[PDB]
Amino acid sequence: ITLVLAAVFLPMAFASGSVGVIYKQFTLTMSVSILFSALLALILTPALC
Amino acid sequence: SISDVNNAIRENNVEIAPGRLGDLPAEKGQLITIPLSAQGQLSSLEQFKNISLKSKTNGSVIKLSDVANVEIGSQAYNFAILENGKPATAAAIQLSPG
Amino acid sequence: VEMAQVDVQNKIKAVEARLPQVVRQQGLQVEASSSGFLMLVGINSPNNQ
Amino acid sequence: GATAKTINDSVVTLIERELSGVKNLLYYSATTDTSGTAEITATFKPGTDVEMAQVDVQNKIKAVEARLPQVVRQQGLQVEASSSGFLMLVGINSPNNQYSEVDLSDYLVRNVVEELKRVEGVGKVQSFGAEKAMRIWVDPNKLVSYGL
Amino acid sequence: ANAVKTAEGVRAKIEELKLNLPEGMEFSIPYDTAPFVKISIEKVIHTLL
Amino acid sequence: SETQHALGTGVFGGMISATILAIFFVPVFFIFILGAVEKLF
Amino acid sequence: VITGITFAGMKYWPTAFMPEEDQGWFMTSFQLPSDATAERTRNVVNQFENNLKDNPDVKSNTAILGWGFSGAGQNVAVAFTTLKDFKERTSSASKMTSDVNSSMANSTEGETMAVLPPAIDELGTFSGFSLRLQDRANLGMPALLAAQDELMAMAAKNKKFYMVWNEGLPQGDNISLKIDREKLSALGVKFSDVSDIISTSMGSMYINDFPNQGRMQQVIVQVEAKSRMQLKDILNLKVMGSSGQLVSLSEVVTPQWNKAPQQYNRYNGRPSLSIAGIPNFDTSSGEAMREMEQLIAKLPKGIGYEWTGISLQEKQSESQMAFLLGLSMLVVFLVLAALYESWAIPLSVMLVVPLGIFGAIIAIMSRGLMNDVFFKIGLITIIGLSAKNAILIV
Incomplete structure (x- = not known):
């Protein structure tokens, strides 16, 4: 789930024009937050629980 | 002297400067502003052949045709072309490196 | 070719200050060409008008 | 000394062609009016480096500069990167009414414009006032009578 | 460039010039778009929390 | 409000439809694709 | 069937780029006729100030007279009107723009158009669709200007266009003085005198600087404003010859009137004029561009169009959506197949995203919101969400 969710936003990030810039702005946060969520879930959540 | 001819050609072909009517600052109550121009350049051959020049000896004005022949011709006569022995004109096309 | 032309223009504007005023007024043309004709295009007058 | 049509015939078309070939160019346009100046604009593909675009444009202008007329060269050509959108308007009002528009304009141009244009991020400061200068308003009727 | 920082710098320079302002002249900034920026972000954060 | 609506309405509807229809259909899709699988083999 | 309905909804519903916003200010542009002096433009701006001071939402409106975007002259003006903080308002900027547009179309003896701030900061100076009408066959300036008039005639009647206009200086009438050199020589006056007096009749002349209060300030010589208002003053200028008499300019000149474009624009190397418009309510930006293309198709030969600024990016956004999806x-x-090394799982994951698109499409149709970029990000997000739903079960 984490990999697919982080990877579906990559293609739109490479579009051309201003819409491409808007897509890049969205994708940065969307992908990085979910990757960090995957890291947190695999690392901290089990011990904390 | 050639200086006289050059000066006459300079002055009679003058390129008057464009201007405008009713430009700022303007009077109170001005409602119309219109660009205006004045043509001061010689148009064709006839005017150039008719350029006035003051002659020292006689004391009366003469015309450019008196002291020169005015024609229309190539700016430079350096180069010529022969396509198959028949006069013509040509231009050479070169390509940028790469 | 573009890099060479820009370098040459840079070195000419570097030396441009030392050149005579008369040379400067007309200007100096820097251009990249091949010094070889590709074709000749002409306008003939077969009717001789 | 040239009208809109004259300045368009003389300079704009000459500069346009060489500018047409810059890298990452998106479109290029030109504007001419009776103000006496040309305004060519080169828009570049989004994401392009502004400094690189400006230096490329200057390189292509100095490449074509040699072919331009002497009168165009003398005044010089200004190449600048701006946004064509106002961020703010800074003015100097006279609520007490001591100073008229001329004094406000001269103070703003002499003092405020130069100080503000140094501040970081200011692409350009467009002043809507003019410096003081001595104006001689000549009555033409007296000139001919006096023989001048 | 950043609009908020440039506007802050311009206003700071104006404030500096309010020291030497001759009597009878008053600085004004009738039009300014920088102030909008913050109010936008602060709404998004409100929708965030 | 307009910008937030343009970004929220579509995602809300898409999530609602996706989940509600998927809980019913996705097993059917899996079974049918497996059916095509043994059709191949 | 659901996939088919989803595709139909994808294709049919109109599209736009960005939603409009109330950013706390609006911009009014005044473009009077070329004959207009600065006094008439000041009168129009004063009417705008009077009509706005009454409103309680106007914090401050500042007017720049003599300068504007897309043109500069005595018949051009701009005005930036700011509005009080949002919580302390009883209206929206769109309503104020509509009211000011209505009043000024009612009576100002000029073209005034009030616009909202641009959708994006620096894509354009106002919100709307922008176009460049170009002459692609050397048809001539007046032929393209007639094409522009024809296009505006069709735009006015169309119900999908609130207002459409030309964002540039208008035409103008010009005067030309042709000197008669034969009579000038007959009366014994040199052409140089006439040329000089014309040159120094209606223009400024910078001579040199002088040292005022520690700075070098210009010295400019010009004729009095009382002697350059009408053509009579110019034709009453007198020149001395060698005959001991003065000749007026009228004696050796003949005024000739012409009507010529006052401004010259070019775009991508073709003579052009720049058009602007707003999409009417019920009409999205995409639909307005579509109909404006349809109406341009019915134009003389050699006349073309090019979408610029916001319009170009809007067209580009819809010109790649299929490829992005x-x-x-x-x-x-590919990621799912590689991760799970199976073919059934990825295809089964694909058999659900039609439903995710279906839900968003039905929701946007229900609420009436158009297809825009934010909707596209929503579609991309829902692709991954539906993938996550299909994975958890398969």
Whole structure:
């Protein structure tokens, strides 16, 4: 789930024009937050629980 | 002297400067502003052949045709072309490196 | 070719200050060409008008 | 000394062609009016480096500069990167009414414009006032009578 | 460039010039778009929390 | 409000439809694709 | 069937780029006729100030007279009107723009158009669709200007266009003085005198600087404003010859009137004029551009159009959406197949995203919101969400 969710936003990030810039702005946060969520879930959540 | 001819050609072909009517600052109550121009350049051959020049000896004005022949011709006569022995004109096309 | 032309223009504007005023007024043309004709295009007058 | 049509015939078309070939160019346009100046604009593909675009444009202008007329060269050509959108308007009002528009304009141009244009991020400061200068308003009727 | 920082710098320079302002002249900034920026972000954060 | 609506309405509807229809259909899709699988083999 | 309905909804519903916003200010542009002096423009701006001071939402409106975007002259003016903080308002900027547009079309003896701030900061100076009408066959300036008039005639009647206009200086009448050299020589006056007096009749002349209060300030010589208002003053200028008499300019000149474009624009190397418009309510930006293309198709030969600024990016956004969706759906397919090393799982994951698109499409149709970029990000997000739903079960 984490990999697919982080990877579906990559293609739109490479579009051309201003819409491409808007897509890049969205994708940065969307992908990085979910990757960090995957890291947190695999690392901290089990011990904390 | 050639200086006289050059000066006459300079002055009679003058390129008057464009201007405008009713430009700022303007009077109170001005409602119309219109660009205006004045043509001061010689148009064709006839005017150039008719350029006035003051002659020292006689004391009366003469015309450019008196002291020169005015024609229309190539700016430079350096180069010529022969396509198959028949006069013509040509231009050479070169390509940028790469 | 573009890099060479820009370098040459840079070195000419570097030396441009030392050149005579008369040379400067007309200007100096820097251009990249091949010094070889590709074709000749002409306008003939077969009717001789 | 040239009208809109004259300045368009003389300079704009000459500069346009060489500018047409810059890298990452998106479109290029030109504007001419009776103000006496040309305004060519080169828009570049989004994401392009502004400094690189400006230096490329200057390189292509100095490449074509040699072919331009002497009168165009003398005044010089200004190449600048701006946004064509106002961020703010800074003015100097006279609520007490001591100073008229001329004094406000001269103070703003002499003092405020130069100080503000140094501040970081200011692409350009467009002043809507003019410096003081001595104006001689000549009555033409007296000139001919006096023989001048 | 950043609009908020440039506007802050311009206003700071104006404030500096309010020291030497001759009597009878008053600085004004009738039009300014920088102030909008913050109010936008602060709404998004409100929708965030 | 307009910008937030343009970004929220579509995602809300898409999530609602996706989940509600998927809980019913996705097993059917899996079974049918497996059916095509043994059709191949 | 649901996939088919989803595709139909994808294709049919109109599209736009960005939603409009109330950013706390609006911009009014005044473009009077070329004959207009600065006094008439000041009168129009004063009417705008009077009509806005009454409103309680106007914090401050500042007017720049003599300068504007897309043109500069005595018949051009701009005005930036700010509005009080949002919580302390009883209206929206769109309503104020509509009211000011209505009043000024009612009576100002000029063209005034009030616009909202641009959708994006620096894509354009106002919100709307922008176009460049170009002469692609050397048809001539007046032929393209007649094409512009024809296009505006059709735009006015159309119900999908609130207002459409030309964002540039208008035409103008010009005067030309042709000197008669034969009579000038007959009366014994040199052409140089006439040329000089014309040159120094209606223009400024910078001579040199002088040292005022520690700075070098210009010295400019010009004729009095009382002697350059009408053509009579110019034709009453007198020149001395060698005959001991004065000749007026009228004696050796003949005024000739002409009507010529006052401004010259070019775009991508073709003579052009720049057009602007707003999409009417019920009409999205995409639909307005579509109909404006349809109406341009019915124009003389050699006349073309090019979308610039916001319009170009809007067209580009819809010119790649299919490719973006296909690439996203291929990327997820390949990633899932590689991760799970099976073919049934990725295809089964694909058999659900039609439903995710269906839900968003039905929701946007229900609420009436158009297809825009934010909707596209929503579609991309829902692709991954539906992938996550299909994975958890398969």
